[PDB]
Write an enzyme that holds these catalytic residues in place. Sequence first.
Site, mmCIF file in Angstrom:
data_model
loop_
_atom_site.group_PDB
_atom_site.id
_atom_site.type_symbol
_atom_site.label_atom_id
_atom_site.label_comp_id
_atom_site.label_asym_id
_atom_site.label_seq_id
_atom_site.Cartn_x
_atom_site.Cartn_y
_atom_site.Cartn_z
ATOM 1 C CE1 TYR A 33 -3.096 -3.085 1.435
ATOM 2 C CE2 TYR A 33 -4.418 -1.231 0.709
ATOM 3 C CZ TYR A 33 -4.296 -2.569 1.030
ATOM 4 O OH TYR A 33 -5.438 -3.369 0.995
ATOM 5 C CG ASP B 155 -17.780 2.851 -0.154
ATOM 6 O OD1 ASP B 155 -18.223 3.094 1.016
ATOM 7 O OD2 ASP B 155 -16.649 3.271 -0.497
ATOM 8 C CG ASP C 255 -12.162 3.939 1.890
ATOM 9 O OD1 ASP C 255 -12.084 3.206 2.906
ATOM 10 O OD2 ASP C 255 -12.825 3.551 0.919
HETATM 11 MG MG LIG Z 1 -14.797 3.472 0.374
HETATM 12 MG MG LIG Z 2 -12.344 1.522 3.955
#
Ligand SMILES: [Mg+2]
Ligand SMILES: [Mg+2]
Lengths: 273, 283
Positions: free
Chosen positions: A89, A106, A111
């Site tokens: 990552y 989602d 995020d």
């Molecule tokens: Mg997301």
């Molecule tokens: Mg996430």
Amino acid sequence: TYTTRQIGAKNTLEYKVYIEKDGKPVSAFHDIPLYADKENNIFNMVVEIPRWTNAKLEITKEETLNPIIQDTKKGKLRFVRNCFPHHGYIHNFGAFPQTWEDPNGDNDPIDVLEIGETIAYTGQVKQVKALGIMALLDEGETDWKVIAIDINDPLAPKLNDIEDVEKYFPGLLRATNEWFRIYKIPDGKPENQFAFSGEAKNKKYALDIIKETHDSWKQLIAGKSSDSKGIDLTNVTLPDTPTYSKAASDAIPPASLKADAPIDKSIDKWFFI
Amino acid sequence: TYTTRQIGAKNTLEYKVYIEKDGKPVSAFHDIPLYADKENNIFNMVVEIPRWTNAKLEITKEETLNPIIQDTKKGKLRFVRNCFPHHGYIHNFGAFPQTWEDPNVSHPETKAVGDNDPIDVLEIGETIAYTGQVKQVKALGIMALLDEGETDWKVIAIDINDPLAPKLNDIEDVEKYFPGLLRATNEWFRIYKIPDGKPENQFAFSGEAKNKKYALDIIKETHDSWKQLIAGKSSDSKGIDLTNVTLPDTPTYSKAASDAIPPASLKADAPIDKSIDKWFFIS
Ligand SMILES: [Mg+2]
Ligand SMILES: [Mg+2]
Ligand SMILES: [Mg+2]
């Protein structure tokens, strides 16, 4: 003060990391305030994945107090493969607590990609500022990616908006675009696609989206969403919520005394897409 | 069989790694044969720095039996910094034993003196190596790096145990199976010391990776330089410790040197200062 409590050995099915407040486990989803300083839009970020690791770690919505665990598929632990020129990552990956992309979205906390110099730790609560936002468009779901920096980063005072990422981290946005596009190709899945031709929208735009997902979470934790199936809403700091339960904190096992389990050497491999 | 003897904790000033044969230390510079299989050009590589690490671990030329120790600057541990988009070293990094980049003559391909070290090797296989590992590799090509103005060839190599090894036989195969790696390698060695306040490095042949045949030619040259060195016949051996336990015809042969090494005292890796995490953006 926020700390972490690890259950199990790292890189096993038993691994869980809970966030503690003054020694007592709390929900990483519900109990960490979104804002460290609302007036100045300083956010608390819950870190899931340290930069340059591979294990796919995430807050689990379905377990009590929402510990961070490793993702599995059909019983096997999931890792992102190394996609040249990237190593695992390429940011500190996490989420903003008290947010939820309501899929009626989602279905997760929004995020966050944190771009600062220091490698973070799983379950860390750090204070960040939002710089901008991208949108991955994934199977009819808008999967927003907030670009953020730790306010304690040496460069933080010089970064306020998305154009600053271009100036101080040139090529990072391009790497982000590439990485998200290709990172599932070694797993036998298609290239992903971005909205806005991969462009990152600015801070003002990011703040609007973050605020919407906070409002969604407020409805959720109030027990008022159309559908919260599969989400444990147990919390230990919000006394007027239907799912408040201080006892959940005491039910968490103690910190495990275990060294990291080894990761299969196949995860070393560099894939050339 | 080759194993390692570790003194102290990784990432400390006390850290040393000796290579052992039969549980006894040998010189990592002088006692490991260049060839595992001469007829088929299979080489022994001494691994110094695993892929995606930072600590600048080096065969120590001036110490008896040449253990791998971390380099220092002003008494502080030296780490190569992360240069975007790379994470530490992007190869398993090491050397061929029984070689020397002769610092006492100008090398004709680069018009510069050698860097005084064994020839460096970039091993490109999937598995991350370990410090003090002796692995067997095939040479695929070579790049003519000038590192701080010194001839500092980089052999491109693959572990013979890598799944792809049978498909990798010359330098063009590296571009086929590892597209972009050689270009990145050019970049990495150009820029890797810019965060330390040093200039960009340069390459002869505009950074071209010359082929296997070229690599074998240069490896031979550096092995021949080493043969002169270990015989005590270099014009200037730069205070290199030539003690060895396996080369009876050399003036510095000493089976006893091995017994004088302290026992293993392996400790858990010490933490690395968080500054080493930093990603530098050069351009
Ligand atoms: Mg997301
Ligand atoms: Mg996430
Ligand atoms: Mg060298």
